[PDB]
């Protein structure tokens, strides 16, 4: 089928989470239809501000997050996929299903957050609600939510950071640890395993 094999589209930003201010909100930047077009072309002149980008393909919607130039998410979401720019679609340059990880060079624009060298465990995650969730760390890869909530809440977070008490990233939501349908605690990403691929 040589000459009717289709490509798949680019990741695109589709918005972001805004933490300028004393109050975190999510922005849309690009609605569901001129989405569609920018995942086919790769080609995304809007311009970027921030540090956790809301983003999309076809089929799924997620979060991406800046951190020292690399713009990182989930396998699980981007798979090997391109993401649109003003120039076209850009190859990733990290690539780890193991750790369900993948990046990209962070979009001319964005700011990107500094890796904690802190060693607390008051964490704080985002979600792409701008929810600000307390998250007590409890392993490399693990920390407990102060205050369970249905998955619901959480899904479409993925790609999202911990961050410290003083706004270092800390980590990469990857997954949520539920009882009947609760979330009772996440997994994630590690920096240091960020800045080992780096
Ligand atoms: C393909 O190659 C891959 C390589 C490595 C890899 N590695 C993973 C750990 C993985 O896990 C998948 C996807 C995440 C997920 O759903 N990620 C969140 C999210 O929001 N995704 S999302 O909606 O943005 C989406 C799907 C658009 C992208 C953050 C959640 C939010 C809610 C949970 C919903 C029920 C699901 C509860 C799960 N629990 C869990 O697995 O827990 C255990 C891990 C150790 C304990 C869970 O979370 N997943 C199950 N897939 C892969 C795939
Ligand atoms: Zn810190």
Redesign the pocket.
């Known amino acids: 089928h040589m000459a009717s094999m289709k490509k798949k589209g680019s990741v695109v930003i589709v918005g972001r989470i805004n933490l300028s201010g004393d109050t975190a909100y999510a922005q849309q930047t690009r609605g569901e239809e001129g989405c569609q077009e920018t995942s086919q072309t790769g080609r995304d002149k809007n311009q970027v501000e921030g540090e956790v980008q809301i983003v999309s393909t076809a089929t799924?919607?997620?979060?991406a997050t800046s951190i020292n130039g690399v713009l990182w998410t989930?396998?699980?979401?981007a798979?090997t996929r391109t993401i649109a720019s003003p120039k076209g679609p850009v190859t990733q340059m990290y690539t780890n299903?193991d750790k369900?990880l993948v990046g990209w060079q962070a979009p001319q624009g964005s700011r990107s957050l500094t890796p904690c060298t802190c060693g607390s465990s008051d964490l704080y995650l985002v979600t792409r609600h701008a929810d600000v969730i307390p998250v007590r760390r409890r392993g490399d890869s693990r920390g407990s939510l102060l205050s369970p909530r249905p998955?619901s809440y959480?899904?479409?977070?993925?790609?999202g950071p911990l961050l410290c008490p003083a706004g270092h990233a800390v980590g990469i939501?990857?997954?949520?640890?539920?009882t009947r349908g609760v979330?009772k605690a996440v997994?994630f990403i590690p920096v240091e395993s960020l800045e080992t691929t780096m």
């Open positions: 799924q919607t997620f979060l989930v396998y699980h979401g798979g299903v369900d998955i959480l899904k479409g977070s993925s790609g939501f990857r997954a949520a640890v539920s979330a997994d």
